Write a protein that binds this ligand. Sequence first.
Ligand SMILES: Nc1nc(=O)c2c([nH]1)NC[C@@H]1CN(c3ccc(C(=O)N[C@@H](CCC(=O)O)C(=O)O)cc3)C=[N+]21
Ligand SMILES: Nc1nc(=O)c2c([nH]1)NC[C@@H]1CN(c3ccc(C(=O)N[C@@H](CCC(=O)O)C(=O)O)cc3)C=[N+]21
Lengths: 357, 350
Amino acid sequence: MRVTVYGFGSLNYYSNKLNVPEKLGGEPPYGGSAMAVEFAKAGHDVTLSDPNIDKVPDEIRKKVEDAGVKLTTDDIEAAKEAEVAILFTPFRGGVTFKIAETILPYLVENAVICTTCTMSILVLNSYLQNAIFLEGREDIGFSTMHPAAIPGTPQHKHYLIATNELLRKPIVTEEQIEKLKKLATDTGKEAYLLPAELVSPVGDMGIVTTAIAFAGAIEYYKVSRDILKTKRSMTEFQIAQSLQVISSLVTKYGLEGLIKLLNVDAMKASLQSMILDKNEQPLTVTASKLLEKIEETIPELIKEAENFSPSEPTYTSAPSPMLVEHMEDLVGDDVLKGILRESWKKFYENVSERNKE
Amino acid sequence: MRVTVYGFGSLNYYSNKLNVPEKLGGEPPYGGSAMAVEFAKAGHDVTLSDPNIDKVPDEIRKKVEDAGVKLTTDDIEAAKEAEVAILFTPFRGGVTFKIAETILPYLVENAVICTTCTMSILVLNSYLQNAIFLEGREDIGFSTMHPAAIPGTPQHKHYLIATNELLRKPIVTEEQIEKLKKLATDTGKEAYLLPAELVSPVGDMGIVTTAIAFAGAIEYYKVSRDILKTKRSMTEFQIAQSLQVISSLVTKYGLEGLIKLLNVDAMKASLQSMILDKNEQPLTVTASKLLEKIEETIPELIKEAENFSPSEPTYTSAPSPMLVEHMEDLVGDDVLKGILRESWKKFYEN
Ligand SMILES: Nc1nc(=O)c2c([nH]1)NC[C@@H]1CN(c3ccc(C(=O)N[C@@H](CCC(=O)O)C(=O)O)cc3)C=[N+]21
Ligand SMILES: Nc1nc(=O)c2c([nH]1)NC[C@@H]1CN(c3ccc(C(=O)N[C@@H](CCC(=O)O)C(=O)O)cc3)C=[N+]21
């Protein structure tokens, strides 16, 4: 099939900022380039579009082209007759939204656009709904080819592929998912089909926070079951509230507001009475020790927290499924889709616009 | 001041169900009784109301009375002079709602009602909105004397006191907050003034999930700062999104649905590319090892997950703070507090 990868992968990032060969392994080029080369070796008609093709060293550029990858800077031409479009594009500056919007009217009928490690597919889908409508591209599907790893390293043995599970409205067809599974297995990668909104939580660099919080939830569950002897429903409420609170505080107030509003000293003091079996609570013990030295490891965040003050009120623990359900009864489903869209767009904007020098 | 503590504390739970003297320390009585004794030793006029006072052993009851605590079974009488009413009341059965509603018309002018770990103060305030209006008790304050520990153990060195921070309308006055700070400080306890909605996630037993997830968010931040060299916005975007999804999965589909939908095998495979400095990532390494043995540690949940099927759809990643403000604009603040109350009820009742 005809596949176009948008984004080569910053050669300088993967060698001078993060020493990928030493930290993870393999050899350059890494990123979308490595993905394209793999597809080309498997017999697919691959094109790779990046604005900085000319900056690629000849030695690297020859390897890619010798695989069968056509290199170009023209995103529009690259999209023509493409069945699969993989966005290995920047999170910053809305670049992933802009590129997807540019290529939208030129993709072949029933094409599928795929996000990777830099963007969640539903957020992209939210940004594109007006373009989709005006251009009549309701045939375009939306899913993912999330390497959940750096392509080109030995750890990349898989792709996370977004499905429609848990979605009120589908974003991808079975025919489109099958093409993504084919690209994965054709290149010896295992396909993990995941509900669309779980792809980025599982696959992104933030798997660090996803996994720690998941294992931490399980640890609390065991303490609740074995030591406290409390009810399952109370345990689940506490887990959901904790994680919703942290998410909402980071969303609205960032890490500085998270630290100031929860109050580390209060958390430390409170946690002492939930260290009930040190041997069975390795995460609790470590967390309590990390909190004790927090002023030494993140002094810049502590300083920002001292100077933080919440300018707007909020509720941090309101479960999103309840808010969505209540909203379904207050307004039409047509209106609700717009509200969910604007909420995903505002999430991206508020978080990326907050980062001010 | 005049303080009334509602609830002695389950003598049975703190010895037979949970061995507090061994696991934590101290000696009985634990709970509301220990709090009342501390206030009385600080010179306050303390009253403790409980329907099962006569079921308290004589040796323990004498210790409490000798400190100056007046024991009674009449909740209404105990409220008539109480400037501060602390609800050391049960977890289930709506007993806290029942007690708070019964004493509301009898509390002194400008009195403050305080919940502990068994009830979010915002949930109680929401429940009582109609009673506050019909009884004309808009002067009554609502806060917490949350011990975030078992009173009577050496770990109880503090109180979490709910404030109006993050609220759109006040639930307590500064004068009332000062009274609670004094009660804490008079008994040698540190007063932690937190936004009302954060007292539960910081003080309750869920502090385990709050602290670990918080620490894991900081660990990722340090990794992004020192190793990945990525921007703060991307780090925050991924934290908020990840914890939003996990939260929604637990709320709507339970722990069984979380395990089935998230895919532990995918998580383990993904996490391999983010263990970039084992010494700087103690939580990541520990979490990665715990994920490998999950089938052994929680087999009953694995069996529930294998039989789980999502019956209804929901957008697990819809950002809660954004939806909160959309709801506020449509139907106002009381409905949002009502949602917090509806959430609490589903899991603490029936
Ligand atoms: N399970 C897992 N998932 C990952 O996604 C993953 C991983 N492990 N191991 C670590 C590598 C490294 N990595 C980066 C992605 C984007 C930028 C990045 O900064 N991108 C900028 C572009 C900077 C620019 O060139 O303008 C942006 O999208 O805004 C950096 C690093 C993902 N990784
Ligand atoms: N920072 C902190 N906050 C706490 O809230 C905290 C703590 N540390 N350390 C330990 C105590 C103990 N604890 C219990 C939780 C649930 C039940 C519970 O579910 N009891 C049920 C059932 C009792 C039974 O088993 O019969 C009930 O009272 O209805 C009991 C006790 C939380 N604690």
